[PDB]
A paper describes a structure:
Guided by the smFRET results, we then used cryo-EM to capture the most abundant structural configuration of wild-type (WT) MRP1 during active turnover. To prepare the sample for cryo-EM, WT bMRP1 (30 µM) was incubated with 80 µM LTC4 and 10 mM ATP-Mg2+ on ice for 10 min before plunge freezing in liquid ethane. On ice, we expect a slower turnover rate and thus even less depletion of ATP. This approximates an ‘active turnover’ condition where ATP hydrolysis has reached steady state. We first used all 1,143,729 particles from the cryo-EM dataset to calculate a 3.4 Å reconstruction that represents the dominant structure under the active turnover condition. Consistent with the single-molecule data, the resulting map shows an NBD-dimerized conformation, with an ATP molecule in the degenerate site and an ADP molecule in the consensus site. To improve the resolution of the structure, we also carried out 3D classification and obtained a higher quality map at 3.2 Å from a subset of the particles, which unambiguously shows an ADP molecule at the consensus site. Other than ADP occupying the consensus site in place of ATP, the overall structure of this post-hydrolysis conformation is essentially identical to that of the pre-hydrolytic structure solved with the hydrolysis-deficient E1454Q mutant (Johnson and Chen, 2018). In both structures, the intracellular gate is closed and the substrate-binding site is pulled apart such that LTC4 is no longer bound. Thus, for MRP1, ATP hydrolysis per se and the subsequent release of inorganic phosphate (Pi) do not induce conformational rearrangements.
Multidrug resistance protein 1 (MRP1) is an ATP-binding cassette (ABC) transporter that harnesses the energy of ATP to extrude substrates from the cytosol to the extracellular space. Native substrates of MRP1 include a variety of antioxidants, pro-inflammatory molecules, and hormones. MRP1 also transports a number of chemotherapeutic agents, thereby conferring drug resistance in acute myeloblastic and lymphoblastic leukemia, non-small-cell lung cancer, prostate cancer, breast cancer, and neuroblastoma. MRP1 is a single polypeptide comprising three transmembrane domains (TMD0, TMD1, and TMD2) and two cytosolic nucleotide-binding domains (NBD1 and NBD2).
Numbering used by the authors: 203 to 268, 311 to 635, 641 to 870, 942 to 1530
The structure:
Amino acid sequence: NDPNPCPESSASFLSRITFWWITGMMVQGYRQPLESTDLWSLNKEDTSEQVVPVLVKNWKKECAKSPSLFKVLYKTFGPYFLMSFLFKAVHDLMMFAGPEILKLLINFVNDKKAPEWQGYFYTALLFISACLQTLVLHQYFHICFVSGMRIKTAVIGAVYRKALVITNAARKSSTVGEIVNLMSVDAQRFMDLATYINMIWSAPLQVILALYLLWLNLGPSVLAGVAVMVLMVPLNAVMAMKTKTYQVAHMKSKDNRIKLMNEILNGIKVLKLYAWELAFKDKVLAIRQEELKVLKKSAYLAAVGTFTWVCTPFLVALSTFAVYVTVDENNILDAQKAFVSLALFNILRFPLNILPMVISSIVQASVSLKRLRVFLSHEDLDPDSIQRRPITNSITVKNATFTWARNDPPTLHGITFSVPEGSLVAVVGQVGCGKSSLLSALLAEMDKVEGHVTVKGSVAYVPQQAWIQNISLRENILFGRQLQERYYKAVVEACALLPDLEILPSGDRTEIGEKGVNLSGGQKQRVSLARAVYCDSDVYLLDDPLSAVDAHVGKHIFENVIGPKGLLKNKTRLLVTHAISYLPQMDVIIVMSGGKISEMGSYQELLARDGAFAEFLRTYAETWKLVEADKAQTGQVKLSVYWDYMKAIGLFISFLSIFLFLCNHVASLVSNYWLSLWTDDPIVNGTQEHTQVRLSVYGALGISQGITVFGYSMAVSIGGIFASRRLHLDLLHNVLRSPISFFERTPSGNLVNRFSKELDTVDSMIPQVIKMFMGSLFNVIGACIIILLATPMAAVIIPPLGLIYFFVQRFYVASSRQLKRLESVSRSPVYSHFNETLLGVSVIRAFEEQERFIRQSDLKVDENQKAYYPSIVANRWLAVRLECVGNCIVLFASLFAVISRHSLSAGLVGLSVSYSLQVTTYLNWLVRMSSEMETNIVAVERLKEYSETEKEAPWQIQDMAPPKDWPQVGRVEFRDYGLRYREDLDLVLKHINVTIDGGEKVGIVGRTGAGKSSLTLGLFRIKESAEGEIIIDDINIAKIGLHDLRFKITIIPQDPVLFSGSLRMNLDPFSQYSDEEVWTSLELAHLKGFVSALPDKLNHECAEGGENLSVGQRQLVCLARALLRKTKILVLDEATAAVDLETDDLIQSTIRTQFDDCTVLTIAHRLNTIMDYTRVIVLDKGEIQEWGSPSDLLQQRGLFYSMAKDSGLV
Ligand SMILES: Nc1ncnc2c1ncn2[C@@H]1O[C@H](COP(=O)(O)OP(=O)(O)OP(=O)(O)O)[C@@H](O)[C@H]1O
Ligand SMILES: CC(C)CCC[C@@H](C)[C@H]1CC[C@H]2[C@@H]3CC=C4C[C@@H](O)CC[C@]4(C)[C@H]3CC[C@]12C
Ligand SMILES: CC(C)CCC[C@@H](C)[C@H]1CC[C@H]2[C@@H]3CC=C4C[C@@H](O)CC[C@]4(C)[C@H]3CC[C@]12C
Ligand SMILES: CC(C)CCC[C@@H](C)[C@H]1CC[C@H]2[C@@H]3CC=C4C[C@@H](O)CC[C@]4(C)[C@H]3CC[C@]12C
Ligand SMILES: Nc1ncnc2c1ncn2[C@@H]1O[C@H](COP(=O)(O)OP(=O)(O)O)[C@@H](O)[C@H]1O
Ligand SMILES: [Mg+2]
Ligand SMILES: [Mg+2]
């Protein structure tokens, strides 16, 4: 029992054949524009739940049986798609039958004596044949399009189901670029094959059936015609083989582009802060140029392919007629037969003119078939590698050796330990020694070479990089679980989240943002912890959850949650710690260096050892929503869009294209009438050579027609490339120029959609639609001009026939357009969900929530399909209506000719029928193509949207540009400075007033969520000042072009962000300076040893956004990045967060030596590294509290004293 079910199920037989059931929606759509709400629920068999499981099953049955073939696996959609063959057969015989009846009528009308009754019968038999072919043809087309739709669901369903199981090593090879490409473009390639796959036999049948009529007419002279056509195949064959290589290279360039764009949109804040977006712009363009260069070559071959097929029947015709006179000198010599022979030849263009699109589709689909087959055949991480015994030690690892990649050398070298039930274990060691690795090994994320691993009970995971969903804070803490009011409140207060829940705008239920961009580092880490704690599992793997928060909250969380008095007192919990404060509280602590456990034991036991760790210890010891969903445009498409696409093509090509179209269709009409005038001439003994004279002229025009067709097919293709190139550059510049607030609002999939699918539409579709539209347009003008001039008194018939076609076209398109918008809008969540999942697969797999996320994906794809399905039915609805109107007019033209056979104008009236069918079929084509054009241009409308938006301040002002040596003394002055993140939200900073003098070392201290990171975000002018101003050395900041600002001051941001490419590229993407400078920087960064010992020294492939190396190494890469610029104002935003105590001591000593003369302000939680500084700023919520020298603030016994006492400096 559905609330709004599809009417197709309940529809009677008469309704189903004519598609009468969609009538109701089409009328509703005309009155007021269609909404997402009044779309019908899908049919049970059109649903991911019913479609995808049978495909993945067949893959399990077929892949397990084996190489693994994907083509044999596409017998899943075979059964349903066979009926299509039967429907296509009947239609072709009815197409063949049509002309026969028309000959008998055109003959009947001529013969005066013929009985009254026999005339009507022919017209009645014509009308019925036209109706039957229409109904049968559109049953065929509906089966083809429904098949295509079901293949789209399954391809997306399978790819998502696979993405959650694939190995890490395979995840590096199959990048996010390929996965997004597979779900988007390759599914559209299979959908487009679904139509034309049925022509592979329908064209040869039609070619044979037309050829046999010539044998019946001519005889054994039709062989030459077959000999010419068979010789043709090899050319199209080798050219198709050549294209197959171009399509592969084109797709590879498209994957690389989408992969790079993903890495840009991930870390856009870092691009904005370092002022790097021009470097990454140039890189995206370089990849686009390669992709477009190949697409041009593919288009050149298509033109040669089209050129070959269009001029085949004329070359066949001349080849055939030569055979007669070169042997048959005895019997045959006819004059009129030529006309019937040419009338039989001129049908052999209708099959051959649709062939190069069949070839293009099959090649394009065959590439996509290989790419999907290669992706679904990747090695799957096996969960039976770990024992996972039912709820005697908690976890046991015995001589286990794990490796990130199968062929690479192992990370963990023969580790051996056992942890008892309800034991608090700690993991310690150097930066990049394999701690996060050890936790990954127990989750079966890493491949193991040898050993034995047993993990008894359910596992809960807290990763080092916090992963938060787009949904409300409560729903993040729940993570798809039933709510317990007692326990929920008990977890939230234990995780120290109450003050954070107070400061948030709408308290608990706030739209948290796409990657938790709203929250601060500590808030993200606390939510991530709270989720895992709420889940209530047997074993707890905590990857440094007390890093980002200060000493106060850290202690609170340790006493209330993790420690032996908290919630998790009884559960086995293995935490990775860098702090040495809580090691006496631990049961056993495991030290590891270079992937080997150096020594295990308790605090006292390890102290008694007098080892390396002992020596280490001595030295240091109604709710407000944020994300706005995509919303469809309401009215008609504005001429601005069309004019913008045409402006990109250029004036020269547009005047050439139209000119060649005219030359083509003029030659078409000259040939048309020159033949029809040649027809009605007597066969006298004279005009013996005239036939051999004029058939050369017919051949010449046939070649001329072919040459021009090749011409305009080329002209439109190059036009399309110019447009597609220009549109991408405008889109990319518009995106890179927008402010940070826009990116925090707009969903990720919202942009991925426009950069992948909407651009792929602009690249491929629109040129083909333009070619077919212009073709149909000039065909209609060409028919109209002929009938009018042949019968000047037929000027009355044209308007009425046009007006009724126009009103059907204007009615239909109004709804058709809106359905294409709804579909195009509703596909954005599908990308967002894919993007959200791929980041947090480790977490999803740890909590075993796969089924829920898989089930969520199915429900998100259903919405896209619910929007798509009415669109294709509406196409069928229109087509049947227009053809049935066409049949009616043909009947009246046909019936009028029989009624008034001999009354008057007997010679003229007989022909009236002949072109009454022509004009009908051409006006039928014009409406359908004009609609297809209006629905396709929506893609360009969608790309334009980010032109009329909010833009960031001008990059280069070039008038008020400050001197080359502007930051000469780092004198930073804040004057009544106040920041506000949104327009409606309350102020984060207010009435800030400090004077940081030149070369002054300034600390910034405060409680988590005090406005520390926001102050540094404010200085770079990422968010524009609400009140007051900042001044850097007697020069106002708001005035200057922010690229003159941003190059002169450096920051180490809180989150370390690396981009996909060589390790050298991350340090310097402009390629400005030498390798000696990079090496001396990596020497000061303390990565020299690590980066030197690597297989490729500085050409190491950092992939997936720097997942190839550890968090603490990304910290040092971001340090090196800052060390290379060597500016006079430096800003540290917790640069020493996820590192050792030893490693921290080093990079501090670096900062003291290198940045000795330049102004440095540092934000920090480790107060150890502040007490050395000259002055310190302390701020609580939005205002600066007591500030001065650290020694002074300790004497005062105020706030800074309280924070020092927690750290244990006092
Ligand atoms: N997914 C991965 N693919 C390939 N190599 C990896 C991967 N993860 C880690 N490594 C390599 O293993 C080394 C150390 O592993 P790991 O990241 O577990 O260190 P860690 O102890 O977590 O360090 P940190 O203290 O920075 O958290 C790194 O130097 C890195 O090159
Ligand atoms: C005689 C005519 C009318 C019918 C035969 C012509 C067509 C259907 C034939 C001739 C050459 C053939 C192509 C030759 C090469 C390729 C590339 C391959 O990777 C996929 C199949 C594909 C694309 C073939 C499909 C069928 C094909 C296009
Ligand atoms: C170089 C050549 C091919 C460029 C040709 C550009 C042509 C095809 C463009 C420019 C303006 C466009 C038209 C603008 C207005 C409408 C009305 C709409 O209800 C149907 C589409 C239709 C009829 C468009 C069809 C495509 C169009 C005619
Ligand atoms: C109609 C008959 C008489 C003449 C036909 C000549 C045709 C085939 C010629 C004349 C001018 C030519 C065009 C001139 C300019 C360009 C731009 C170039 O970057 C790609 C090829 C392209 C698009 C050419 C394609 C072929 C072309 C259209
Ligand atoms: N992009 C944002 N949009 C709206 N509010 C934000 C944003 N970033 C941070 N906030 C809010 O401002 C407060 C202070 O943030 P911030 O100064 O960045 O944290 P911290 O001082 O801990 O580094 C936080 O409690 C947070 O809720
Ligand atoms: Mg780690
Ligand atoms: Mg911060």
